[PDB]
Design a protein around this ligand. Structure first.
Ligand code: PIO
Ligand code: PIO
Lengths: 606, 606
């Protein structure tokens, strides 16, 4: 983090500056660095603050000839790495490779500079603190700085390609993680050119990711297209139109528990959505969704709608009886109460409601059995945090099933107050039907807009709206504390004044007006101020920024709908039985092609 | 001002045109101006309307050879400036320098033309009347016209760099104040090149502003970057990423009472906000806000929210007793009144309200002690006029504390009518919580939008809305003056007709409708006209221009939020004790660097 790196950098510059050997290595004096090196008592193993030698200083400031004098004074400076924590394995070869001083790389490799050196300090890790991630080996350093000849020269002296770091990343992984993609595709070609073969391309990191899977996850569409140039075979071309066969082994991921498409659609990187726009992935999901995914999602949508209708019908016809106790209160409004369990089921219609309630609790147990192990199979925050996988819809469906089982416990144990979980369950259950809106293009991104207004716009403006409601509700309550509550009951106590001011903010109830009595004038002053600031200004401000939130989602409508039908497709292929979801693509074994599955794409060009 | 300048210009052209010597100097006649100059009785000291000589006329119309004949006729014309008020010190050298006639500059400097001449007329001051501001000395004139060789020639003949004018501005100040910056940066380089040294760069004007501070205040981002090229030192570069150390002495402004960042953020010039986008300022405020400013602002926000909760709770539980006098009026609605001070505190809950009220008045005194001297330390209009410093929020918090102290005066002196300052104090206090919305990016510019709709849109449309309310309220009142007020009480008297028409404009109450009686038909005609013009047309017009006001603020959202967290950071560093705010940046004294503080920035490039 920042102050530790700053302390390390000024200490390193101080130990360069005070030491005359390191200063002469820094500023490249040929008047100096010959009198000092002719002393046999002079310490050529003098280290800086981070344990770096004078050769590290000469490689850092691009002093080639000073590094040659430091090398001929003592040849062991190439073997020595730095020692302190942010640079705990860095050699002078790493600095010469990053600086791309190629004659210095030849001068170091003429000496005994190790090519298998691991620069495993904290300044070389993949972190948000570090501005780059190049790896720990000099070969990955030379691949990431983009110099071809240093890569070939490291190949000429050792430096095997298959080197895995602390993250398990091969040089192909780190080259995929670089921001410049077209500048690194040529390096990916030349690094694959020295492959002698478990292949180099198929070895994973510590996250289990293949370079194909890492190119899919990180949004590297250029590298994905480059990797699918070598996985495709043009069957024929004829005039404008050509038929080509894409290998579907790395994309479909049949035997894998965590598939490639599931890895891409549930990735934190946003640009992985443009991975879904690339061709064999696009026709693969189009075949999976049109052939199987849309009818299965439609019959699940209709079955859930019928289950909601059964739940709603057993909610309307719930057992209620006239209350035995008397009212004796003009404010009291309840004329009937809940029925006891011993008298709830005495008739035929109550038995019809019983089989409806049994269907309801069976469906809630089915929901819990379907959605509880998929919380545990992935990250618990990752399951609910995803806007594409239906995470908010997942937590709504989970708490709906929990409220239905709580209602069953309340019914079996004769607990009064069954209105509460039944009302929450009705609202959350019928709002759960919007999960199936993602199966259609016409109302798919509408729920994405609704989600981006719930947690996008409402969570920020709710604080300003809340403090306006608190101030005007407090003023409205204390200006009516001295008045008769029969003539104007909107602000009689503090919770009903809070609720009335919330409804007057949203303009869903009328302004309180009794023209048969004369109200306080401070009601008129504070309500004119409230109607100016809250109903007129802040409400339409919230409406306008909801509008441009809707505009921002509507610009990316097709990509977001494509991503959520991908998440729906991989969810349905993962959850449903294997006989209902046959393996996608051309089988290939009967055509002489060996145990590989393919997708044929015919496209029209010039 | 305009007519005086016009009268001066036509008088000057008249005195040129009537005088044959000045006419021959104007239109460059070599047939003339040899017969006239051979007369020994001819007055070569003949002056125009502004006291300008014939050499001023020859320098004004770029007549070089006419100026040579005027100089060899009488060499003292270079020593004479003009005399009347808009040009009370202007010489012919100033006109020759502005015209960039360099041979005329050599011809004047061959004679005894003073280079320390001050053209201190009203046409050379920094005013909105004058279209340019070049200064009073010819060296600043040559710097601001951008001619390099005239600057070098003036250096060859006197003309010291460190010349301060009536505004105290050095040539560096005036060169910063020029609108075209990149062509003036090389002139700044040349003017710093003849510095022999209190330095030239550190001398202030009469406002106390350094050229660094003036470049920050005026929004000169190009000159700010040029001034920070000489205040930075690259520690190292390595491949794509470099670490460089910025001097933080001129930016942090430790011992100064009016700091650099406070000068930039409270400046009237708008482009100074882009000064906040430049690099060491940006990481300095990012370090100050993330390390210290955001937690201190968050604990102050939570403490103010708890103080509002205590004030609101002692507002709800205020002492009220049943009224002794009888009602005897069907319109009368008050059933209880304020309690006397002798009986207000008799119970334990009244003592809890007493310690809450003591906390409330202590907080109001604390607010007044914190915000009254900062009105006086700056401009009184400047404190409240700033949208970034929280000036409207400052006057709301000031009047909230004033209303709380007025409420304490009413409580101690048993004054009836305590609803009024308590209701205003509740509204203004809970609206003061939006001051702390600027500490978060997600709801920071929302209050800027609210302010730009209060004083931007509402103050212009309130007049049109007001005259519509007056006309329709007057018509609604006089069409119901003849009717029974029991059947329709919305327009019974003129203030309630005004309030009803305001609420019907905002559509927060229903249209008045009694279907048990037959209303006047002019109520239906005027309400149809009102519903067309006011509820439908002008209200949605106000909503639409509120929407594009919101759009205009949302385009500059990050810059406005950055400016207001800068104002928050400099407010918190100025107000809070020094032990809670340590000095920002690297100390530097332990690294051998002499008594200067630095900020290290590491950045990634090609
Ligand atoms: C009762 C239901 C509970 C639901 C539980 C689940 C609630 C939940 O998980 O929502 C998280 C929500 C959005 O989730 P998510 O991480 O997927 O959204 C990302 C990010 O939040 C951006 O704001 C999005 O907009 P933009 O492109 O940058 O403009 C962008 O969407 P997209 O570009 O990829 O489409 C995404 O990068 O994040 C919040 O906004 C903070 C509010 C916290 C949520 C409030 C938690 C109470
Ligand atoms: C009760 C609370 C009292 C509050 C007391 C304090 C009230 C108060 O001081 O507001 C002043 C207000 C805005 O102040 P301020 O000078 O900072 O705003 C500038 C200017 O007014 C422009 O209109 C702004 O918009 P734009 O960019 O050109 O489009 C621009 O904002 P920004 O670009 O910098 O962001 C600024 O250059 O000026 C008025 O609009 C006239 C209404 C007079 C105010 C009405 C006075 C009653």
């Amino acid at each position: 983090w920042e102050q530790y790196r700053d302390r390390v950098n000024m200490l390193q510059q101080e130990r360069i500056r005070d030491s005359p050997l390191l200063q002469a290595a820094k500023e490249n004096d040929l008047r100096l660095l010959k009198i000092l090196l002719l002393n046999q008592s002079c310490d050529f193993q003098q280290r800086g603050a981070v344990g770096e030698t004078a050769l590290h200083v000469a490689a850092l400031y691009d002093n080639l000839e000073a590094a040659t004098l430091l090398m001929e004074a003592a040849p062991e400076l190439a073997k020595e790495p730095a020692l302190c924590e942010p640079f705990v394995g860095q050699t002078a070869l790493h600095i010469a490779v990053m600086n791309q001083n190629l004659n210095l790389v030849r001068a170091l490799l003429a000496r005994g500079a190790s090519v298998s050196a691991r620069a495993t300090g904290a300044a070389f890790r993949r972190s948000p603190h570090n501005l780059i991630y190049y790896g720990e080996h000099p070969l990955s350093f030379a691949a990431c700085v983009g110099s071809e000849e240093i890569v070939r020269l490291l190949i000429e002296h050792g430096a095997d390609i298959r080197a895995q770091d602390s993250l398990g990343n091969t040089v192909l992984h780190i080259l995929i993680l670089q921001p410049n993609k077209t500048f690194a595709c040529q390096m990916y070609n030349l690094l694959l050119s020295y492959d002698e073969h478990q292949s180099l391309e198929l070895v994973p990191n510590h996250q289990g990711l293949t370079p194909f899977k890492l190119a899919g996850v990180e949004g590297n569409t250029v590298m994905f297209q480059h990797l699918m140039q070598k996985r495709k075979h043009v069957q024929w071309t004829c005039g404008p139109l050509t038929s080509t066969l894409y290998d579907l082994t790395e994309i479909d991921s049949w035997g894998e528990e965590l598939s490639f498409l599931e890895l891409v659609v549930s990735s934190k990187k946003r640009e992985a959505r443009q991975i879904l726009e690339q061709t064999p992935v696009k026709e693969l999901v189009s075949f999976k969704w049109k052939k199987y995914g849309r009818p299965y999602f439609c019959v699940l949508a209709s079955l859930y709608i019928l289950y909601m209708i059964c739940f709603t019908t057993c909610c309307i016809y719930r057992p209620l009886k006239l209350r035995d106790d008397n009212r004796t209160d003009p404010r009291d409004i309840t004329i009937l109460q809940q029925k006891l369990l011993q008298e709830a089921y005495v008739t035929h219609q109550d038995n019809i409601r019983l089989v409806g309630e049994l269907v309801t609790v069976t469906g809630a147990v089915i929901i819990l059995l379907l959605e509880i192990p998929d919380i545990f199979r992935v990250g618990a925050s990752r399951y609910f945090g995803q806007t594409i996988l239906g995470g908010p819809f997942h937590v709504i469906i989970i708490t709906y099933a929990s409220l239905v089982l709580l209602t069953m416990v309340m019914r079996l144990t004769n607990m009064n107050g069954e209105v509460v979980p039944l009302s929450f369950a009705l609202v959350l259950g019928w709002c759960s039907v919007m999960y199936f809106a993602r199966g259609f293009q016409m109302l798919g991104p509408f729920t994405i807009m609704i989600q981006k207004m719930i947690f996008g716009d409402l969570m920020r403006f709710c604080w300003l709206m809340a403090v306006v409601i608190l101030g005007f509700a407090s003023a409205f309550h204390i200006t009516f504390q001295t008045e008769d509550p029969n003539n104007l009951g909107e602000f009689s106590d503090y919770p009903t004044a809070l609720f009335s001011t919330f409804e007057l903010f949203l303009t869903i109830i009328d302004g309180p007006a009794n023209y048969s009595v004369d109200l306080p004038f401070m009601y008129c002053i504070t309500y004119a101020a409230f109607a100016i600031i809250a109903t007129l200004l802040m409400l339409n401000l919230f409406i306008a920024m909801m509008g441009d939130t809707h505009w921002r989602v509507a610009q990316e409508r097709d990509e977001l709908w494509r991503a959520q039908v991908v998440a729906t497709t991989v969810m349905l292929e993962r959850k449903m039985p294997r006989f209902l979801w046959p393996r996608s693509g051309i089988c290939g074994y009967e055509y002489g092609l060996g145990d590989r599955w393919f997708l044929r794409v015919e496209n029209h060009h010039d």
